[PDB]
């Protein structure tokens with residue numbers, strides 16, 4: 001807020017940096033291969049559509065608004081047992 | 096090397112001789128000396144301010160008598176607190192209180208004596224009650240033009256003090272100088288009685304003392320009637336009619352609200368009959 005009293009307070013803005021993401025990992029150390037569609041264009045993915053491709057856990061990005069438009073793949077061997085609505089790491093069941 | 100923006104803690108006792116000794120030299124400019132303690136690089140306190148002889152021939156660096164301070168410091172030892180000297184100040188009542196040609200010549204002399212030697216100016220004229228006015232500055236070395244010329248870290252205490260920027264010639268002295276932040280370390284013990292001593296002396300002296308009858312209302316009725324027609328012609332002047340005259344124009348104020356409070360003065364002063372008596 002005020003770093004003009006002490007300059008380290010401007011370098012204490014380093015506290016505002018925190019990691020956040022979503023994960024499609026099934027379980028344990030095994031990394032599944034899963035690709036599911038998304039209805040949002042790459043224009044949101046650009047960092048200066050029919051179907052998209054998301055990981056397949058490294059995971060893939062999603063916007064909080066893009067969580068509702070994505071649907072779990074029905075043709076994949078690995079399908080989630082829990083309904084997928086919001087982000088975060090969720091379980092993925094192998095068929 | 097490392098230079099941090101300084102914060103000046105002034106005592107309510109040190110604020111006295113700044114304006115008071117400055118008032119004694121009015122109109123002419125005075126030369127004082129600041130008294131305080133150096134805590135660290137980024138903060139500084141002035142715990143006392145004393146009066147120095149005013150120069151009727153103009154301010155000079157020799158106006159400060161060294162045996163005047165040597166006899167003063169000895170009298171400060173028998174006084175409660177014998178604190179070491181810090182810096183200097185001077186009044187400039189005749190203008191906007193900026194560092195003059197003599198003030199820069201006494202800078203390198205005083206900054207050789209003491210490390211900082213903060214330059215402090217003060218003026219009576221800019222306001223009376225509700226403004227800090229005064230002034231302060233600190234010499235940034237012109238030999239540093241080879242090095243980085245933009246101190247200090249922790250900026251806006253300067254940057255905000257750099258507002259309003261106070262015209263041109265004042266900040267025209269921002270070359271070779273930089274001002275310093277003045278905040279008040281709490282004296283509120285004294286500051287609480289400062290309000291109590293001021294307002295109680297201003298409240299009817301006992302609050303009792305203060306607590307042209309019909310005639311004051313016969314003089315008021317001329318303001319409550321004869322002023323009405325010159326006020327109530329304006330709505331007939333608002334009727335054009337209609338409409339060739341430039342609009343809008345609002346004549347409602349200030350007489351309406353004045354006559355309101357005029358009754359508020361007369362009603363509660365007439366309540367003194369019901370209030371004081373029984």
Ligand SMILES: [Zn+2]
Nearest residue numbers: 154195197198
């Ligand atoms: Zn001067």
